[PDB]
Design a protein around this ligand. Structure first.
Ligand SMILES: Nc1ncnc2c1ncn2[C@@H]1O[C@H](COP(=O)(O)OP(=O)(O)O)[C@@H](O)[C@H]1O
Ligand SMILES: [Mg+2]
Ligand SMILES: [Zn+2]
Lengths: 82, 280
């Protein structure tokens, strides 16, 4: 989302927001408010996404080998990208 | 002390030895301070090494993170020192009844590394240490016989302005040529021209570095051919002593390859190497 075509998805969402707001306040229907809420939720989702957490089963004791790494990133994604 | 007079009584005591260097291993990195990094919190700590043992931590030293057995050794961030192993052969004189001379191993660290070359006579002061040998790789079991070696702490390989002021005084002497020609070979009698010719070989010509061509070297070659009983070999030995480098090769005792260089193989490295002949 942040990389493809320099993130023009955000510009498209903004354009939808402009189309919604253009109509008058007293003429606004619930659907317009739904669309505005959808755009805001889209922005919140884009901002909020963050790397997960490393969960490990604890049925038995810690082996003497121990934890090697807790990296939880996809193959092609590095920290700086997100 | 002699290499054949070291007894168990003299273990862990400072001794003095003299011998001939036979072979030295390349530089060996010896760990000094280890470096550990926690795999979870990426916390780094350095721990010391005592008696060849790493004082590893059981769990991360941080308070918030205490995951056990999560510490790993970063090999390339630990401090290291220099180690080298040398083999010393006792001087031929010490041999009692003409047998294979004994040898003693030496260890040198830090500055003394690469201080003695192969085929040199040195006097070394160090501690006569003893250490066990493990019977096999995969057990703590030890052999009852201990290996003996020496921990070297000192090695000695066996111009001032005043001298320059002194040397410049001789040059002013008018009869310098005769003085040097008479001092090069004191014993030989009435061979002043031969001595003079020999002397000019020691000094040598002048060196020239020359691009657009090749280097020109000022080296002089002299032939001494004459009647047998005259002092020819004596002068050869006399000059052989003075020069810093030289090989006393003879006739029918040297070979074409022996003079220039010999192609061989290094057993330790299993690579093709070449030795230096008499001329080289
Ligand atoms: N002018 C001289 N000065 C000193 N010693 C001489 C002289 N002439 C002959 N000798 C003696 O004679 C011997 C000649 O032997 P050497 O020098 O081996 O002869 P070559 O090497 O030519 O066969 C020497 O041992 C040397 O002591
Ligand atoms: Mg001769
Ligand atoms: Zn930690």
């Amino acid at each position: 989302i942040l990389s493809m075509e320099s993130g023009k998805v955000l510009r498209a969402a903004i354009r939808l927001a402009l189309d919604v707001i253009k109509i008058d306040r007293l003429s606004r229907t619930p659907r317009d408010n739904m669309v505005l809420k959808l755009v805001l939720n889209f922005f919140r989702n884009v901002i909020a996404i963050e790397p997960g957490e490393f969960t490990i089963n604890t049925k038995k004791s810690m082996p003497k080998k121990g934890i090697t790494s807790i990296d939880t990133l996809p193959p092609n994604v590095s920290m700086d990208d997100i | 002390k002699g290499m054949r007079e070291l007894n168990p009584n003299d273990i862990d005591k400072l001794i003095n030895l003299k011998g001939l260097v036979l072979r030295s291993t390349p530089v060996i990195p010896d760990m000094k301070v280890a470096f550990f990094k926690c795999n979870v919190c990426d916390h780094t700590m350095a721990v010391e090494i005592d008696r060849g043992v790493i004082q590893e931590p059981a769990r991360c030293e941080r308070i918030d993170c205490n995951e056990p057995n999560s510490m790993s050794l970063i090999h390339n961030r630990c401090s290291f020192a220099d180690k080298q192993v040398i083999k010393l052969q006792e001087t031929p004189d010490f041999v009692p009844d003409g047998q294979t001379p004994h040898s003693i191993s030496l260890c040198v660290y830090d500055e003394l590394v690469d201080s003695c070359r192969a085929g040199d006579r040195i006097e070394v002061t160090g501690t006569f240490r003893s250490i066990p040998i493990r019977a096999n790789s995969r057990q703590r079991v030890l052999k009852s016989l201990y290996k003996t070696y020496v921990d070297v702490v000192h090695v000695k390989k066996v111009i001032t302005d005043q001298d320059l002021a002194k040397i410049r005084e001789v040059a002013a002497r008018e009869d310098l040529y005769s003085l040097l020609a008479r001092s090069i070979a004191p014993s030989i009698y009435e061979l002043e021209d031969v001595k003079k010719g020999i002397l000019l070989q020691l000094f040598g010509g002048t060196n020239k570095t020359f691009t657009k061509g090749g280097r020109y070297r000022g080296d002089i070659n002299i032939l001494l051919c004459g009647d047998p009983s005259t002092s020819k070999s004596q002068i050869l030995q006399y000059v052989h002593k003075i020069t810093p480098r030289g090989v006393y090769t003879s006739g029918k005792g040297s070979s074409a390859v022996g003079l220039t260089a010999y192609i061989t193989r290094d057993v330790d490295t299993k690579q093709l190497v070449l030795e230096s002949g008499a001329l080289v």
